[PDB]
Design a protein around this ligand. Structure first.
Ligand SMILES: O=C(NCc1ccccc1Cl)c1nccnc1NCc1ccccc1Cl
Ligand SMILES: O=C(NCc1ccccc1Cl)c1nccnc1NCc1ccccc1Cl
Ligand code: PRO
Ligand code: PRO
Ligand SMILES: [Sr+2]
Ligand SMILES: [Sr+2]
Ligand SMILES: [Sr+2]
Ligand SMILES: [Sr+2]
Ligand SMILES: [Zn+2]
Ligand SMILES: [Zn+2]
Lengths: 496, 483
């Protein structure tokens, strides 16, 4: 069973659902967490979808070394300046020291692009579309939260290089739309497509696109993924040059993109869909979609091998119709134990089979998201359970998206922007775009915060500039700072 | 290809891995880039091995890469052999950590503390976990791509059982899977054997392994290991369960561990690769067949055989034949031939205006080079039979080189004559550690102990002593200089 309440102490609710669903085990190194098979299967389900899609775009999988030299890491000046204090350095091999300290990748820009330069000698070498599934290390000192904020995490990073800027800009939106599919269609989480501000953009690129999700339990938003257009800032430092047949002599630099998505996906899935009973898995990423457990001392041993065979009969039928099913035929656990054990893990459907239900050619089907039981005939298991599982996926998303539509509004002044901020909601406001003004928003929001006992206050930072804002910017509408005119509607709010 | 294998295979190796677009070099010694052509071979190995172990009940996971210093030295024998190879993190940016952090050379010390918490009763075992990850063993010896790298990819399965023969059963069936990976997939016959006290995994009781042989180098190479750790780790990591019968009798858990690294790709190139580029076995071939148009180019008729090109591709993918249509108009067909030859695609399909109207095409094997013309109606049947022929020929040819280069030696004079000829030898051994260090210096290169084969070449009669002449021989051990 679960003890902590989600509506009150969300932090303790989160630490108990990730451990009692057997997803996360803690490690003696702070910030590093063990991804148990239950959580890792979700990442592999995300991997199977995203891998099959980038290959359609012409992207191939590879693996680059995790260690970066000093000179290679410092070629891009501003890119290394943002990641510098967050880089873990290897300075000794056992007892003997290293002649040159090597760095662990916080990202593989400075690792791949020296190789991109050698691979690009003419126009026939482009485009290059490479992706890798690996781990990276960012030793940020902020308080770590499993899945969401970890010193080491798993991700994919795709790095593409084009001779054209139109080809590169086209890929940025293509990948970001795939990221939205990962959250909306696999995790049943609505996201807001948008562009990062100049303060929050990827240091070293021209612009950064992103998807932002909302967690109503804490009133905080979180970035689900990013797709950057690096322009030529890396091609001009790493000399990824080529000769154009139309214009010769002038050394042309390649246009590059970089896009990443991490295991944070699993943490957002926990915060959005989880309840006070435990985890709640979307059926499209659930390791097992339907769990089968026999229900119901003096019973003869002949009929004991009969109902477990119907369980194996159900398990085998669902596998032919492509439904991930587990048969919990373990006898050392009580039926009530495995009841809470599997809804703590969040399996979308629990299949119950009592002795009387078996003889009556029927079985019970309990839903995880709502708890509704349904006595189903034994000839309806393949077509109806598939219809129930798909109904789980849509209601989790329609509830989460109705939860987001309610919690995302518009405000045109600090009085409204701050008031609705204390309402545990995010809000799009007219923004001038200046960086120092964005610091002023994050300052006067934590300064004038109307909080409640139990919830700390943090300044509202920028999240994204939505491609499709709620309402259009009025002609001549000034920014909320008053000292500068507004350039666009910008989504703000407290963030993870 | 430029260099030659028989002459300088070390430069032939560097030539074939880069021209095949498998390996790219990095400004940090020992670290190499796995380009898509090399990574696909590792994925083919991964898809097979992950599917075979899932039948055994082991689940995939991912454990942290950073191991604390208290957890590292909690097993004194394990840290004794790995400490000089452990790369240590000491600073975050420029703020130095109060306690240094170690990168995993293996995950025994990372996982087993968590095993102790997951084992509270008898119902918690067996625990079977595996992870696909990178690993770092910072060694200052001569690096060589795939074979000897400071960083490499692998899988590592860590199982914990209640009885010893439950763990003993898994050690042999995982080792048999590693044999399938090398023989059934990579067409590399190996010898199943056991380790010596000096060579066994520091922290275990006995170590099983498969050893491969590289003919053009005369040196053997460890292809994989499946250890039986016993109760050594569980006693120092308190992974225990209560005795079900007698009360208060705390019992240590029996553990295993097994690994398989990207060295598989390097042994594949060292064994099968010739002097015309790479040679890929069709089972692990990313691109099995490749179709290239050939052959006053009538644009209307030119649009007719490129459709005949895509016709074969649509026919072959229906029979699960992996094929890419190399129809790039910015490169000559002769360039495409040498491009896919250096990559080692097993079969290459050619179609010109003459044979397209003749309803036929030629298919040349990568291993042999036989340009055999075949009919159009009998394509999928023939192309499949030739792909299987490549897999079995490369297998029988590599085993012919194995049996020829795997000989038996009784005394010390014959052992040194056949070892310096570029072959491995099975010598009588007393099992002592210092005798293995002596035979290493008698012929020094220097020969190291490879494996104690489960199936020796010849039986040992009671009476023959070891090569040192002092102690009797308990078993005949395969020896030779390693990598
Ligand atoms: O940011 C992260 N780790 C920094 C950190 C380290 C220690 C303590 C606090 C923190 Cl925040 C992070 N951690 C785990 C998962 N995802 C993460 N980032 C999201 C992300 C990154 C890059 C591209 C796309 C995305 Cl979506
Ligand atoms: O050991 C290796 N690299 C150490 C090293 C680093 C620098 C210089 C020299 C050396 Cl030897 C190694 N490198 C690449 C591939 N596999 C490797 N190990 C084989 C192995 C290990 C564990 C279980 C099974 C196997 Cl098969
Ligand atoms: O870290 C980032 O944000 C980009 C995207 C993946 C690679 N680098
Ligand atoms: O390093 C080794 O050889 C064993 C096998 C994988 C885990 N530890
Ligand atoms: Sr491509
Ligand atoms: Sr920073
Ligand atoms: Sr710009
Ligand atoms: Sr050592
Ligand atoms: Zn402003
Ligand atoms: Zn001896």
């Amino acid at each position: 069973g679960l003890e902590a309440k989600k509506e009150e102490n969300l932090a303790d609710w989160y630490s108990q659902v990730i451990t009692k669903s057997e997803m996360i085990e803690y490690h003696d190194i702070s910030g590093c967490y063990i991804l148990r098979p239950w959580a890792y299967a979700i990442w592999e389900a995300i991997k199977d979808f995203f891998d099959a899609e980038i290959k359609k775009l012409g992207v191939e999988n590879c693996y680059f070394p995790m260690f970066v030299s000093q000179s290679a890491l410092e070629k891009e000046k501003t890119h290394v300046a943002d990641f510098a204090p967050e880089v873990a350095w290897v300075t000794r091999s056992g007892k003997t020291e290293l002649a040159e300290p090597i760095a662990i990748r916080p990202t593989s820009e400075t690792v791949m692009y020296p190789a991109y330069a050698k691979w690009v000698q003419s126009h026939r070498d482009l485009p290059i579309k490479l992706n890798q599934w690996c781990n990276v290390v960012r030793w940020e000192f902020k308080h770590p939260q499993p899945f969401l904020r970890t010193r080491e995490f798993l991700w994919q990073e795709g790095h593409s290089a084009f001779a054209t800027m139109e080809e590169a800009a086209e890929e940025v939106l293509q990948i970001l739309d795939l990221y939205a599919q990962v959250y909306e269609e696999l995790l049943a989480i609505p996201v807001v497509k948008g562009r990062k501000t100049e303060k929050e953009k990827f240091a070293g690129g021209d612009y950064t696109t992103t998807i932002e999700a909302f967690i109503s339990a804490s009133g905080r938003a979180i970035q689900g993924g990013t797709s950057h257009h690096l322009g030529q800032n890396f091609s001009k430092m790493f000399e990824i040059v080529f000769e154009d047949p139309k214009i010769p002599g002038e050394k042309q630099f390649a246009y590059q993109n970089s896009w990443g998505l991490t295991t944070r996906t699993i943490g957002v899935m926990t915060m959005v869909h989880g309840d006070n009973m435990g985890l709640v898995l979307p059926p499209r990423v659930a390791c097992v979609q339907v769990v089968i457990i026999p229900c119901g001392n003096a019973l003869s041993e002949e009929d004991k091998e009969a109902l477990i065979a119907k369980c194996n009969d159900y398990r085998r039928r669902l596998l032919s119709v492509n439904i991930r099913v587990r048969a919990d035929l373990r006898d050392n656990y009580s039926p009530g134990w495995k009841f809470n054990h599997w809804e703590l893990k969040g399996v979308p459907i629990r299949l119950e089979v009592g002795p009387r239900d078996m003889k009556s050619c029927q079985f019970v089907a309990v839903r995880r998201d709502t708890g509704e039981k349904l006595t189903v005939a034994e000839n309806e298991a393949e077509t109806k359970l598939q219809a129930i599982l798909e109904d789980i996926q849509v209601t989790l998303f329609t509830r989460a998206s109705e939860d987001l539509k309610t919690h995302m509004v518009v405000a045109n002044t600090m009085e409204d922007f701050q008031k609705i901020l204390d309402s545990g909601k995010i809000v799009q406001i007219p923004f001038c775009g200046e960086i120092d003004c964005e610091d002023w928003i994050k300052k006067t929001t934590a300064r004038d915060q109307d909080l409640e006992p139990g919830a700390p206050s943090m300044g509202a930072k920028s999240l994204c500039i939505p491609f499709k804002p709620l309402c259009e910017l009025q002609p001549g509408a000034k920014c909320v700072c008053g000292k500068n005119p507004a350039k666009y509607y910008t989504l703000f709010g407290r963030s993870y």
